[PDB]
From a paper:
In the development of new therapeutics, targeting the structurally similar enzymes Rv1086, [name] and Rv3378c that are involved in cell-wall biosynthesis and virulence-factor production may be a possible approach. All three proteins belong to the cis-type prenyltransferase (cis-PT) family, which adopt the ζ-fold. Rv1086 produces ω,E,Z-farnesyl diphosphate (EZ-FPP; C15) from geranyl diphosphate (GPP; C10) and isopentenyl diphosphate (IPP; C5), which is used by [name] for further elongation to form decaprenyl diphos­phate. The reaction catalyzed by [name] (or [name] DPP synthase, MtDPPS) is very similar to that of undecaprenyl diphosphate synthase, except for the chain length of the final product (C50 versus C55) and the starting allylic substrate (EZ-FPP versus EE-FPP). In fact, most cis-PTs share a common dimeric architecture, and the conserved S1 and S2 sites for substrate binding are located near the subunit interface.
Author numbering:
A (entry chain A), B (entry chain B): 12 to 296
The structure:
């Protein structure tokens, strides 16, 4: 089975049109049955590679790295790189749908980022709020289920609430799930699962001796997230930087040199073709 | 400073001579103070690169992968490759001392390797027992502090016992610490810390709302293990396979294509040179 969408007609809408910022997402033909719309094709009009379902990653995690560097190299303010990265998120979501990926986790704001200047942090909080607000209806139309993954302390209420609205609006979608990870840290996530387990123990609802690896997994914030199959990071940095820490224990790493504002869905597809050539054993044989 | 040992005299003993098995570890001249002996130099007589201490990794973790394929490519039984890996362990210990590395974690058997055949599991358990018995006096003489890291259920008692003797005999050594990781799994290690935390809660000695990331770290099996700075894996596989999961959250990954039985201390040094040259990102420790 090859779960790629059939190639788009030559005149099907494309994405992204970078002649404006924010980028205007194209109107799409209404879906016949009334379900999700077919995503716009890339402006190159490349088509997704034919990868069989048993060699496709179910869950791709991406550390979207290189935005500030991209801007500084051009003599632009670092925030201009983040701005350009918004369209890349949407392009990669479209390409993931075209390829057949069912889960996509995006590292939008790390807990490490509180070390940045408070001005850049304020920009990044407001920008993530704005991206979700600006793109939630497009994501809904594409069949995306999106929700927040992350930690509460210090995170703006407006960001949590904007994502909660998007989650409620897309809860029944099932083309692809996006974990939009904001104020996320893998050790912190595990710690919060351990706290919840501890609360249940204190209340007499859980015997400590019954705790297993599955107990931890069931007490993570979003226990429906599957293991990460393919872990991507741009800009040449070869670190997972605490992203999807529990979930990516057996992930394949494919570290790519392009900066995130230069990335497009063809780069995602190339990493997925490389993944498909690999053999995963999970400690067996 | 530059904490490397200087090049050895031309006639200083070398290691390893893989023309016999078990490999012979050479007699070494007594150390002046009566302390640890200078390790034998590599057969090639290469000397460790001059890397300043602030640029060296404090803690290197190594997944010792590719032993079985090394043997199968030669028409040998898989476990002949593991036998060749023993000399490589000791060569890498010697090279880590020459370079100035203070912490080395070695992945010798995972919690997932029980999925292998009973024949191969029996071999690997007995082999790890035998490696520790054969080499702990040598490691002691070099100033290595070695001890077991891993999970107790299923692990053979003979392995735990040999490592317990090695731990007691080297507990005062301080040239380098080797975490010898057998029946190790990062998710399981975290689970066991969470269990201990839960026992403290049930006993009224720990409040859930006082649990922090440091609480988890303090309840890992070996809480003195520092973060992994540099994570290496041989054989061309680009995955961490649940090794040092909490500790390597922020590590740099270097994937080396050589199979473990072909590896030597110069390959460890090459990876450390790459690590030392990498530009360190904003906010990193
Ligand atoms: C582009 C979007 C929507 C989110 C990613 C923003 C973000 C906080 C990335 C973290 S790494 P970055 O700021 O990009 O790193 P540098 O090249 O500036 O060193
Ligand atoms: C060298 C020593 C002391 C222990 C070897 C530890 C060990 C089982 C490493 C994995 S190599 P393995 O996965 O068995 O070999 P491949 O199938 O991946 O070629
Ligand atoms: C080195 C070890 C003792 C275990 C990790 S290497 P292993 O071959 O188990 O890892 P996978 O390729 O994921 O199966
Ligand atoms: Cl630097
Ligand atoms: Mg394994
Ligand atoms: Mg292997």
């Amino acid at each position: 089975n090859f779960p790629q969408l059939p190639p788009a007609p030559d005149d099907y809408p494309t994405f992204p049109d970078t002649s404006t910022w924010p980028v205007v997402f194209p109107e799409l033909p209404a879906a016949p049955y009334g379900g999700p719309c077919r995503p716009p094709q890339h402006t190159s009009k490349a088509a997704a590679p034919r990868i069989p379902a048993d060699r496709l990653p179910n869950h791709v995690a991406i550390v979207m790295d290189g935005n500030g560097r991209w801007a500084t190299q051009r003599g632009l303010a670092r925030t201009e790189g983040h701005k350009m990265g918004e369209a890349v998120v949407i392009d990669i979501a479209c390409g993931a749908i075209e390829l057949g990926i069912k889960w996509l986790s995006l590292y939008a704001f790390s807990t490490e980022n509180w070390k940045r200047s408070p001005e850049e942090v304020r920009f990044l909080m407001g920008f993530n709020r704005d991206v979700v607000r600006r793109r939630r209806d497009t994501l809904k139309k594409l069949g995306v289920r999106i929700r927040w993954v992350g930690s509460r302390p210090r995170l703006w209420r407006s960001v949590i609430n904007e994502l909660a609205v998007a989650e409620e609006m897309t809860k029944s979608n099932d083309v692809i799930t996006i974990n939009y990870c904001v104020n996320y840290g893998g050790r912190t996530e595990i710690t919060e699962a351990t706290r919840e387990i501890a609360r249940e123990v204190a209340a007499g609802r859980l015997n400590p001796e019954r705790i297993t690896e599955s107990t931890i997994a069931r007490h993570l914030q979003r226990p429906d997230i599957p293991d990460v199959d393919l872990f991507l990071r741009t800009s040449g940095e070869q670190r997972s930087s605490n992203f999807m820490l529990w979930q990516a224990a057996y992930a394949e790493y494919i570290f790519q040199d392009k900066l995130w504002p230069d990335y497009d869905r063809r780069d995602l597809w190339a990493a997925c073709e490389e993944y498909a050539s690999r053999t995963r054993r999970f400690g067996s044989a």
